[PDB]
Amino acid sequence: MNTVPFTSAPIEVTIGIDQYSFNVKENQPFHGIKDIPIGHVHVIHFQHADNSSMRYGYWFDCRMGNFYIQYDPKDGLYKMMEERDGAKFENIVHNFKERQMMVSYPKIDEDDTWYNLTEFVQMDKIRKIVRKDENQFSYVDSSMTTVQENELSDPAHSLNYTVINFKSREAIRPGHEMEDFLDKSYYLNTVMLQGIFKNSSNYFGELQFAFLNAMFFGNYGSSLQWHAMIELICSSATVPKHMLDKLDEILYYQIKTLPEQYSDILLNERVWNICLYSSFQKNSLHNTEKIMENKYPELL
Amino acid sequence: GAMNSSNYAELFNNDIKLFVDDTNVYRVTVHKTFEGNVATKAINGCIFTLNPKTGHLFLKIIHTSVWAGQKRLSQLAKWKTAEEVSALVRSLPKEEQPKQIIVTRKAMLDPLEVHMLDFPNIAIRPTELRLPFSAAMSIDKLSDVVMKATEPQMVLFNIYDDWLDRISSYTAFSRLTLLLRALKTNEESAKMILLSDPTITIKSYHLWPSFTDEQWITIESQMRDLILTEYGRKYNV
Numbered sequence: 403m404n405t406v407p408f409t410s411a412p413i414e415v416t417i418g419i420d421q422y423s424f425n426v427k428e429n430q431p432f433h434g435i436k437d438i439p440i441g442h443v444h445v446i447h448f449q450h451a452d453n454s455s456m457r458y459g460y461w462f463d464c465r466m467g468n469f470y471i472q473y474d475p476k477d478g479l480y481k482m483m484e485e486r487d488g489a490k491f492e493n494i495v496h497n498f499k500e501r502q503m504m505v506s507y508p509k510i511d512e513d514d515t516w517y518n519l520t521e522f523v524q525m526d527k528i529r530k531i532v533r534k535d536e537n538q539f540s541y542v543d544s545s546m547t548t549v550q551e552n553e554l555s556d557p558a559h560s561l562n563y564t565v566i567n568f569k570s571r572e573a574i575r576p577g578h579e580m581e582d583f584l585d586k587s588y589y590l591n592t593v594m595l596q597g598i599f600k601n602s603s604n605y606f607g608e609l610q611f612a613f614l615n616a617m618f619f620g621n622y623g624s625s626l627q628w629h630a631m632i633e634l635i636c637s638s639a640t641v642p643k644h645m646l647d648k649l650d651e652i653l654y655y656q657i658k659t660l661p662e663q664y665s666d667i668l669l670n671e672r673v674w675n676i677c678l679y680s681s682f683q684k685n686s687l688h689n690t691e692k693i694m695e696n697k698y699p700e701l702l
Numbered sequence: 703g704a705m706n707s708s709n710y711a712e713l714f715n716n717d718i719k720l721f722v723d724d725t726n727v728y729r730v731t732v733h734k735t736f737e738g739n740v741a742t743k744a745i746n747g748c749i750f751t752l753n754p755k756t757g758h759l760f761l762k763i764i765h766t767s768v769w770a771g772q773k774r775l776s777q778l779a780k781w782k783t784a785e786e787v788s789a790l791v792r793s794l795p796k797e798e799q800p801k802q803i804i805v806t807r808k809a810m811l812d813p814l815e816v817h818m819l820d821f822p823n824i825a826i827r828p829t830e831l832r833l834p835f836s837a838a839m840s841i842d843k844l845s846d847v848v849m850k851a852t853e854p855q856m857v858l859f860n861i862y863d864d865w866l867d868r869i870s871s872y873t874a875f876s877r878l879t880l881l882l883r884a885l886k887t888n889e890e891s892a893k894m895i896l897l898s899d900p901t902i903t904i905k906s907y908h909l910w911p912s913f914t915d916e917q918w919i920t921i922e923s924q925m926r927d928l929i930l931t932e933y934g935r936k937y938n939v
């Protein structure tokens with residue numbers, strides 16, 4: 403179990419850690435989060451009580467270092483920092499606990515949800531989408547635009563998701579215009595899987611990261627990317643069978659975790675009706691179809 | 703963006719543009735078989751690609767052999783249209799290539815955009831004008847060259863004959879659309895109006911009769927009357 407201490411909590415905030423969230427009052431005695439199931443990935447995120455604009459947060463792996471949060475009164479946000487003095491960090495985290503001013507990461511043993519949502523997400527790939535090499539953790543917020551969006555304005559603050567554009571030369575072989583537009587298998591298998599992502603694990607990892615950035619920060623470009631990566635698979639007549647069966651599990655858990663009252667903003671009606679009812683893979687997403695119908699029938 | 707009656711005069715500026723109408727590409731007759739069923743038979747079709755400023759019409763004849771052994775022909779027809787328009791553009795020198803292509807039917811947008819990926823500076827747009835280019839096959843000489851074709855063929859016409867010697871492009875396009883709207887609404891009566899006087903001839907190299915300026919005014923009135931008469935008949939007005 404790892405710990406993320408907080409120096410203090412000078413401003414009232416809602417704090418998310420992975421799929422959980424809790425509230426901290428202004429100047430409340432709060433010194434962070436204890437008992438974190440070390441994993442391969444976590445996210446800690448913030449939405450200030452006095453301004454719910456800008457949700458923001460940090461993706462991190464407890465195995466890469468000792469991280470803590472300190473509020474910056476000049477920039478007005480909670481900042482992640484790495485503590486390079488391990489003896490100092492151990493001194494804090496064995497004491498702050500000893501004072502009992504930390505909240506415990508509340509994991510139920512039956513609940514496998516965080517790893518089902520982040521199975522293919524890895525920090526090394528996160529750090530290529532969010533470029534900031536001096537830190538081992540990665541900052542994302544509600545406003546950051548994607549590289550693709552920028553192409554249609556600060557490259558340092560962009561999300562470098564893989565560009566997917568169904569009406570592009572990359573997606574359409576000259577001489578195969580109708581074929582490749584109606585069946586995106588070439589673009590999925592040769593261009594994306596074999597060429598760019600190299601394997602399905604990296605593809606699913608970016609798909610999962612995009613979903614989570616959309617849900618936790620309300621990042622619109624991440625939502626576009628999530629939907630694009632689903633539609634690319636579903637609109638391909640030829641998809642390895644291991645990929646289809648795994649996709650159904652991935653999407654099921656994403657739909658299961660989505661807030662019920664956030665459906666009007668996090669689910670694209672066109673993409674989902676196409677994937678579940680029209681596409682080549684309409685019959686290949688049995689579990690996702692079943693949760694979507696019984697949880698969000700109005701979208702369909 | 704889409705074209706409409708606000709930016710209508712823009713059609714006659716000096717940026718080359720082409721209308722593309724695909725409604726006569728896939729054409730069939732519907733008849734009854736021997737078991738009693740109903741079967742279709744394709745007949746030759748055409749793509750109507752018209753530069754509205756100069757009158758130039760690139761009539762690509764779609765020969766029925768295109769369809770042999772193919773499935774989902776109404777879908778294929780859109781992609782075949784897009785393939786041929788792209789080929790036309792590619793064949794042209796750069797300074798003659800269109801800056802914009804306006805499709806009369808929105809279903810043509812994605813096929814044409816995909817086929818035109820090599821030309822990212824050519825804008826592909828729909829229109830909110832209801833244009834009557836589906837009645838192109840009511841023009842006898844166009845219908846005749848399409849039906850007689852035995853292989854794919856491109857035929858060039860000036861759909862304005864020599865009118866631009868005397869009137870503006872704007873006026874010529876209005877006359878063209880009036881004639882075609884009348885032909886679409888009551889083809890036989892519209893043809894009567896045009897061929898009523900055997901002393902006014904169609905030049906071997908023209909599509910329409912050689913009317914004087916004052917005869918065109920009369921003809922246009924008669925076509926407006928035909929269109930309004932048919933409206934009243936249809937809606938009981």
Ligand SMILES: CC(=O)N1CCc2ccccc2[C@@H]1CC(=O)O
Nearest residue numbers: 718753756758794798799800858
């Ligand atoms: C695009 C278009 O309408 N063209 C260019 C190609 C071409 C070729 C043969 C005859 C006419 C045209 C017309 C003439 C013109 O409008 O400038």
